[PDB]
Symmetry: C3
Subunit: 90 residues, 3 copies
């Protein structure tokens, strides 16, 4: 079994995002103040970390998904997840 999670939040309501790596797949659960719901993030990986920041009221999220020794960065900037420029030499 053994899932692994990562979490981030922003604002005062707040918004919360919880990422779960489970059996090689990372998924996302969301709270915007009233009920948990499933987010759009779906990417492969066995390990996840996350950070986020606001620019004014606009949220930006970066999820670091790793499989084996390879880490891929995924970016939310308000209109869909895209692959980020992150590289590492592991």
């Amino acid at each position: 079994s053994s899932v692994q999670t990562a979490a981030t939040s922003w604002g005062t309501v707040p918004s919360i995002r919880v990422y779960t790596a489970n059996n090689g797949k990372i998924t996302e659960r969301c709270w915007d103040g009233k009920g948990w719901y499933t987010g759009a993030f779906n990417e492969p990986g066995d390990n996840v970390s996350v950070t986020s920041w606001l620019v004014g009221s606009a949220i930006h999220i970066r999820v670091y998904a790793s499989t084996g020794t390879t880490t891929t960065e995924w970016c939310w900037d308000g209109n869909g997840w895209t692959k980020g420029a992150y590289t590492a030499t592991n």
Copy 2:
């Protein structure tokens, strides 16, 4: 062996909380500016993540404790840890 940790902080002093999952138990160490001490958080799990936010000067902490594929959310809102509404279908 193999412990796994998660950390959060708030303010400028700052306050720091470090959660350690060890042998199926999650515990908490605290810094409020002058010496580390043991916190009230004690919950079962093999994996931990955490996030926190301020509303004014009031801290709110959410700890995501997982055992197997089951994640439980624990909430600090200034007066004791309580189970949160988080659910996931892992």
Copy 3:
């Protein structure tokens, strides 16, 4: 294989730091707005978490590196990494 990561960010640009535990070594990749580059952090461990805070414009980072059941705190306060006072009894 299996790397494990932790991430923190600050500001609005933003600055991002991603820590990777790989084969007992923790290293750091950095973003300050224009290109990823390798950071100064190099410490042993199989597990990593991180938190950070600003005092004005001055960033402070705490990395919690664990090997076996032993966690060491590493501190960035603008002029080099130093060992922190964190202790735990795992």
